[PDB]
């Protein structure tokens, strides 16, 4: 009666990720790569769909 | 019984943040902090600066 | 008359050159005072990672 409910509670904690984190991580965390954080050398091509 | 109640409390605590889609579904972008309005200055973009 | 005319040109022109050079150096100093926040925020992002 309890543990599966906790699993359902676990089923809550996953769903907030794919709703927002695997949106948000795919916004800033995925774009926090070291290839675009350098400064005064911006002639290097950034990782984007429109070069 | 109380552990079931607190597991439901934790599940509903996650569900409350999952229920953040109650805002207007018009051009859904910029996931912002809860009540992030005053610090959200209109910084000009790549072109506008 | 010619020598004094040239002297009065040169002294005030040198003063104006100092004024403009120091004004643009103050602009560059404000630029670097904005740049220190940039690098500090970069190390903050690295420590966040």
Coordinates of N, CA and C in Angstrom, one line a residue:
Chain A
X1 N 0.8 -1.2 0.0 CA 0.0 0.0 0.0 C 0.9 1.3 0.0
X2 N 2.1 1.2 0.5 CA 2.9 2.4 0.6 C 4.0 2.5 -0.5
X3 N 4.8 1.4 -0.7 CA 6.0 1.5 -1.5 C 5.6 1.9 -2.9
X4 N 4.6 1.2 -3.5 CA 4.2 1.5 -4.8 C 3.7 3.0 -4.9
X5 N 3.0 3.5 -3.9 CA 2.7 4.9 -3.8 C 3.9 5.8 -3.9
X6 N 5.0 5.4 -3.2 CA 6.3 6.1 -3.3 C 6.8 6.0 -4.7
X7 N 6.6 4.8 -5.4 CA 7.0 4.7 -6.8 C 6.2 5.6 -7.6
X8 N 4.9 5.7 -7.3 CA 4.0 6.8 -7.9 C 4.6 8.1 -7.6
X9 N 5.0 8.4 -6.4 CA 5.7 9.6 -6.0 C 7.0 9.7 -6.8
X10 N 7.7 8.6 -7.0 CA 8.8 8.5 -7.9 C 8.4 8.9 -9.3
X11 N 7.2 8.3 -9.7 CA 6.6 8.6 -11.0 C 6.3 10.1 -11.2
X12 N 6.1 10.8 -10.1 CA 6.0 12.3 -10.1 C 7.3 12.9 -10.5
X13 N 8.4 12.5 -9.8 CA 9.7 13.2 -9.8 C 10.4 13.1 -11.2
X14 N 10.1 12.0 -11.9 CA 10.6 11.9 -13.3 C 9.9 12.9 -14.2
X15 N 8.6 13.1 -14.0 CA 7.8 13.8 -15.0 C 8.1 15.3 -15.1
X16 N 8.5 15.9 -14.0 CA 9.0 17.2 -14.0 C 10.2 17.4 -14.8
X17 N 11.0 16.4 -15.0 CA 12.2 16.5 -15.8 C 11.9 16.7 -17.3
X18 N 11.3 15.6 -17.9 CA 11.0 15.6 -19.3 C 10.0 16.8 -19.7
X19 N 9.2 17.3 -18.7 CA 8.4 18.4 -19.0 C 9.3 19.7 -19.1
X20 N 10.2 19.9 -18.2 CA 10.9 21.2 -18.2 C 12.4 21.0 -18.2
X21 N 13.0 20.1 -17.4 CA 14.5 19.9 -17.4 C 15.0 19.5 -18.8
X22 N 14.4 18.4 -19.3 CA 14.8 18.0 -20.7 C 14.2 19.0 -21.7
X23 N 13.5 20.0 -21.3 CA 13.5 21.2 -22.1 C 14.6 22.2 -21.8
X24 N 14.7 22.6 -20.5 CA 15.7 23.5 -20.0 C 17.1 23.1 -20.1
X25 N 17.4 21.8 -19.8 CA 18.8 21.4 -20.0 C 19.1 21.4 -21.5
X26 N 18.2 21.2 -22.3 CA 18.3 21.3 -23.8 C 18.3 22.8 -24.2
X27 N 18.2 23.7 -23.3 CA 18.3 25.2 -23.6 C 19.6 25.8 -23.2
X28 N 20.0 25.6 -21.9 CA 21.2 26.2 -21.4 C 22.3 25.2 -21.0
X29 N 21.9 24.1 -20.4 CA 22.9 23.1 -20.0 C 23.6 22.5 -21.2
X30 N 22.7 22.2 -22.2 CA 23.3 21.7 -23.5 C 24.1 22.8 -24.2
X31 N 23.7 24.1 -24.0 CA 24.4 25.2 -24.6 C 25.4 25.8 -23.7
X32 N 25.8 25.2 -22.6 CA 26.8 25.7 -21.7 C 28.2 25.0 -22.1
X33 N 28.3 24.6 -23.3 CA 29.6 24.0 -23.8 C 30.7 25.0 -23.7
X34 N 32.0 24.5 -23.6 CA 33.1 25.3 -23.5 C 33.5 26.0 -24.9
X35 N 32.9 25.6 -26.0 CA 33.2 26.1 -27.3 C 32.7 27.5 -27.6
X36 N 31.8 28.0 -26.7 CA 31.1 29.3 -27.0 C 31.3 30.2 -25.8
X37 N 32.0 29.8 -24.8 CA 32.2 30.7 -23.6 C 33.5 31.5 -23.7
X38 N 34.2 31.4 -24.7 CA 35.5 32.2 -24.9 C 35.1 33.6 -25.4
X39 N 36.0 34.5 -25.0 CA 35.7 35.9 -25.3 C 36.9 36.6 -26.0
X40 N 36.7 37.6 -26.8 CA 37.6 38.3 -27.7 C 38.0 37.5 -28.9
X41 N 37.7 36.2 -28.9 CA 37.9 35.4 -30.1 C 36.5 34.8 -30.5
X42 N 35.7 35.5 -31.2 CA 34.4 35.1 -31.6 C 34.3 34.8 -33.1
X43 N 35.4 34.9 -33.8 CA 35.5 34.4 -35.2 C 35.3 32.9 -35.3
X44 N 35.5 32.2 -34.2 CA 35.3 30.7 -34.2 C 33.8 30.5 -34.4
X45 N 33.4 29.5 -35.2 CA 32.0 29.3 -35.5 C 31.3 28.6 -34.3
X46 N 30.2 29.2 -33.9 CA 29.4 28.7 -32.8 C 28.6 27.5 -33.2
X47 N 28.2 26.6 -32.3 CA 27.5 25.4 -32.6 C 26.0 25.8 -32.7
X48 N 25.5 26.0 -33.9 CA 24.1 26.3 -34.2 C 23.8 25.9 -35.6
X49 N 22.4 25.8 -35.8 CA 21.9 25.3 -37.1 C 22.2 26.3 -38.2
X50 N 22.4 27.6 -37.9 CA 22.5 28.6 -38.9 C 23.9 29.2 -38.8
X51 N 24.9 28.6 -39.5 CA 26.3 29.0 -39.5 C 26.4 30.4 -40.2
Chain B
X1 N -0.3 4.7 7.4 CA -1.3 5.6 6.9 C -0.6 7.0 6.8
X2 N 0.1 7.5 7.8 CA 0.8 8.8 7.7 C 1.9 8.8 6.7
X3 N 2.6 7.7 6.5 CA 3.6 7.6 5.5 C 3.0 7.6 4.1
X4 N 1.9 7.0 3.9 CA 1.1 7.1 2.7 C 0.7 8.6 2.4
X5 N 0.2 9.2 3.5 CA -0.1 10.6 3.4 C 1.0 11.5 3.0
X6 N 2.2 11.3 3.6 CA 3.4 12.1 3.3 C 3.9 11.8 1.9
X7 N 3.8 10.5 1.5 CA 4.2 10.2 0.1 C 3.3 10.9 -0.9
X8 N 2.0 11.0 -0.6 CA 1.0 11.7 -1.4 C 1.4 13.2 -1.3
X9 N 1.8 13.7 -0.2 CA 2.3 15.1 0.0 C 3.5 15.4 -0.9
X10 N 4.4 14.5 -1.0 CA 5.6 14.7 -1.8 C 5.2 14.6 -3.3
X11 N 4.3 13.7 -3.6 CA 3.9 13.5 -5.0 C 3.1 14.7 -5.5
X12 N 2.2 15.3 -4.6 CA 1.5 16.5 -4.9 C 2.4 17.7 -5.0
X13 N 3.5 17.7 -4.2 CA 4.5 18.8 -4.2 C 5.2 18.8 -5.6
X14 N 5.5 17.6 -6.1 CA 6.1 17.6 -7.5 C 5.0 17.9 -8.5
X15 N 3.8 17.5 -8.3 CA 2.7 17.7 -9.2 C 2.4 19.2 -9.3
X16 N 2.6 20.0 -8.2 CA 2.3 21.4 -8.3 C 3.3 22.1 -9.2
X17 N 4.5 21.7 -9.2 CA 5.5 22.3 -10.1 C 5.3 21.7 -11.5
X18 N 4.8 20.5 -11.6 CA 4.5 20.0 -13.0 C 3.3 20.7 -13.6
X19 N 2.4 21.3 -12.7 CA 1.2 22.0 -13.2 C 1.5 23.4 -13.5
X20 N 2.7 23.8 -13.9 CA 3.1 25.1 -14.3 C 2.6 25.5 -15.7
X21 N 2.0 24.6 -16.4 CA 1.4 24.9 -17.7 C 0.1 25.6 -17.7
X22 N -0.3 26.1 -16.5 CA -1.6 26.8 -16.4 C -1.5 28.2 -17.0
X23 N -0.3 28.7 -17.3 CA -0.2 30.0 -18.0 C -0.6 29.9 -19.4
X24 N -0.7 31.1 -20.1 CA -1.1 31.1 -21.5 C -0.2 30.4 -22.4
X25 N -0.7 29.5 -23.2 CA 0.1 28.8 -24.2 C 0.2 29.5 -25.5
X26 N 0.9 30.7 -25.4 CA 1.1 31.5 -26.6 C 2.6 31.8 -26.7
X27 N 3.3 31.2 -27.7 CA 4.7 31.3 -27.9 C 5.5 30.8 -26.7
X28 N 5.4 29.5 -26.4 CA 5.9 29.0 -25.2 C 7.5 28.9 -25.3
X29 N 8.1 29.8 -24.6 CA 9.6 29.8 -24.5 C 10.0 30.6 -23.2
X30 N 11.3 30.6 -23.0 CA 11.9 31.2 -21.8 C 11.2 30.6 -20.5
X31 N 11.6 29.4 -20.1 CA 11.2 28.9 -18.8 C 11.9 29.8 -17.7
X32 N 11.1 30.6 -17.0 CA 11.7 31.6 -16.1 C 11.5 31.1 -14.7
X33 N 12.1 31.8 -13.7 CA 12.0 31.5 -12.3 C 10.6 31.8 -11.9
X34 N 10.1 31.2 -10.8 CA 8.8 31.5 -10.3 C 8.7 32.9 -9.8
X35 N 7.8 33.7 -10.5 CA 7.6 35.1 -10.4 C 8.9 35.9 -10.7
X36 N 9.4 35.7 -11.9 CA 10.6 36.4 -12.5 C 10.0 37.5 -13.4
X37 N 9.7 38.6 -12.9 CA 9.2 39.7 -13.7 C 10.0 41.0 -13.6
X38 N 10.4 41.4 -12.4 CA 11.1 42.6 -12.2 C 12.5 42.5 -12.7
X39 N 13.2 41.4 -12.4 CA 14.6 41.2 -12.9 C 14.7 40.9 -14.4
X40 N 13.5 40.6 -15.0 CA 13.5 40.3 -16.5 C 13.5 41.6 -17.3
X41 N 14.6 42.3 -17.3 CA 14.8 43.5 -18.1 C 14.9 43.1 -19.6
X42 N 14.3 43.9 -20.4 CA 14.3 43.7 -21.9 C 15.7 44.0 -22.4
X43 N 16.6 43.1 -22.2 CA 18.0 43.2 -22.8 C 17.9 43.1 -24.3
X44 N 18.4 44.1 -25.0 CA 18.4 44.0 -26.5 C 19.2 42.8 -27.0
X45 N 18.8 42.3 -28.2 CA 19.3 41.1 -28.7 C 20.6 41.3 -29.4
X46 N 21.1 40.3 -30.2 CA 22.3 40.4 -31.0 C 22.2 41.6 -31.9
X47 N 21.0 41.8 -32.6 CA 20.9 42.9 -33.5 C 20.6 44.2 -32.8
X48 N 19.7 44.2 -31.9 CA 19.1 45.4 -31.3 C 20.2 46.2 -30.5
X49 N 21.1 45.6 -29.9 CA 22.2 46.3 -29.3 C 23.1 47.0 -30.3
Chain C
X1 N 54.3 87.2 -33.9 CA 52.9 86.9 -34.1 C 52.7 85.5 -34.6
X2 N 53.4 85.0 -35.6 CA 53.3 83.7 -36.1 C 53.7 82.6 -35.0
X3 N 54.8 82.9 -34.3 CA 55.2 82.0 -33.3 C 54.2 81.9 -32.1
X4 N 53.7 83.0 -31.7 CA 52.7 83.0 -30.6 C 51.4 82.4 -31.1
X5 N 51.0 82.6 -32.3 CA 49.8 81.9 -32.9 C 49.9 80.4 -32.9
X6 N 51.1 79.9 -33.3 CA 51.4 78.5 -33.3 C 51.4 77.9 -31.9
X7 N 52.0 78.7 -30.9 CA 52.1 78.3 -29.5 C 50.7 78.2 -28.9
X8 N 49.8 79.2 -29.2 CA 48.4 79.1 -28.7 C 47.6 78.0 -29.4
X9 N 47.9 77.7 -30.6 CA 47.4 76.5 -31.2 C 47.8 75.2 -30.4
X10 N 49.1 75.1 -30.2 CA 49.7 73.8 -29.8 C 49.3 73.5 -28.3
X11 N 49.4 74.5 -27.4 CA 49.1 74.3 -26.0 C 47.7 73.8 -25.8
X12 N 46.7 74.5 -26.3 CA 45.3 74.1 -26.2 C 45.0 72.9 -27.0
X13 N 45.6 72.7 -28.1 CA 45.4 71.4 -28.8 C 45.9 70.2 -28.0
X14 N 47.1 70.4 -27.4 CA 47.6 69.3 -26.5 C 46.7 69.1 -25.3
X15 N 46.1 70.1 -24.8 CA 45.2 70.0 -23.7 C 43.9 69.2 -24.1
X16 N 43.4 69.6 -25.3 CA 42.3 68.9 -25.8 C 42.6 67.4 -26.2
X17 N 43.8 67.2 -26.7 CA 44.2 65.8 -26.9 C 44.3 65.0 -25.6
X18 N 44.8 65.6 -24.6 CA 44.8 64.9 -23.3 C 43.4 64.6 -22.8
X19 N 42.5 65.6 -23.0 CA 41.1 65.5 -22.5 C 40.4 64.4 -23.2
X20 N 40.5 64.3 -24.6 CA 39.9 63.3 -25.3 C 40.5 61.9 -25.1
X21 N 41.8 61.8 -25.0 CA 42.5 60.6 -24.7 C 42.1 60.0 -23.4
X22 N 42.0 60.9 -22.3 CA 41.6 60.4 -21.0 C 40.1 60.1 -21.0
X23 N 39.3 60.8 -21.7 CA 37.9 60.4 -21.8 C 37.7 59.0 -22.4
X24 N 38.4 58.7 -23.5 CA 38.2 57.4 -24.1 C 38.9 56.3 -23.3
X25 N 40.0 56.7 -22.5 CA 40.5 55.7 -21.6 C 39.6 55.4 -20.4
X26 N 38.8 56.4 -20.0 CA 37.8 56.2 -19.0 C 36.7 55.3 -19.6
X27 N 36.3 55.5 -20.9 CA 35.4 54.6 -21.6 C 35.9 53.2 -21.6
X28 N 37.2 53.0 -21.9 CA 37.8 51.7 -21.9 C 37.8 51.1 -20.5
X29 N 38.0 51.9 -19.5 CA 38.0 51.5 -18.1 C 36.6 51.0 -17.7
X30 N 35.6 51.7 -18.1 CA 34.2 51.3 -17.8 C 33.9 50.0 -18.6
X31 N 34.5 49.9 -19.8 CA 34.4 48.6 -20.6 C 35.0 47.4 -19.8
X32 N 36.2 47.6 -19.2 CA 36.8 46.6 -18.5 C 36.1 46.3 -17.1
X33 N 35.5 47.4 -16.6 CA 34.7 47.2 -15.4 C 33.4 46.4 -15.6
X34 N 32.9 46.5 -16.9 CA 31.9 45.5 -17.3 C 32.4 44.1 -17.6
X35 N 33.7 44.1 -18.1 CA 34.3 42.8 -18.5 C 34.6 41.9 -17.3
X36 N 34.9 42.6 -16.1 CA 35.3 41.8 -14.9 C 34.0 41.0 -14.4
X37 N 32.8 41.6 -14.6 CA 31.6 40.9 -14.3 C 31.4 39.7 -15.2
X38 N 31.8 39.9 -16.5 CA 31.7 38.8 -17.5 C 32.6 37.6 -17.1
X39 N 33.8 37.9 -16.8 CA 34.7 36.8 -16.4 C 34.3 36.1 -15.1
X40 N 33.9 36.9 -14.1 CA 33.4 36.4 -12.8 C 32.2 35.5 -13.0
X41 N 31.2 35.9 -13.8 CA 30.1 35.1 -14.2 C 30.5 33.8 -14.9
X42 N 31.5 33.9 -15.8 CA 32.0 32.7 -16.4 C 32.6 31.7 -15.5
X43 N 33.4 32.1 -14.5 CA 33.8 31.2 -13.5 C 32.7 30.7 -12.6
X44 N 31.6 31.5 -12.4 CA 30.4 31.0 -11.7 C 29.7 29.9 -12.5
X45 N 29.6 30.1 -13.8 CA 29.0 29.0 -14.6 C 29.9 27.8 -14.6
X46 N 31.2 27.9 -14.6 CA 32.1 26.8 -14.6 C 32.0 26.0 -13.2
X47 N 31.9 26.8 -12.1 CA 31.7 26.1 -10.8 C 30.3 25.5 -10.7
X48 N 29.3 26.1 -11.4 CA 28.0 25.5 -11.5 C 28.0 24.1 -12.2
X49 N 28.8 24.1 -13.3 CA 29.0 22.8 -14.0 C 29.7 21.8 -13.2

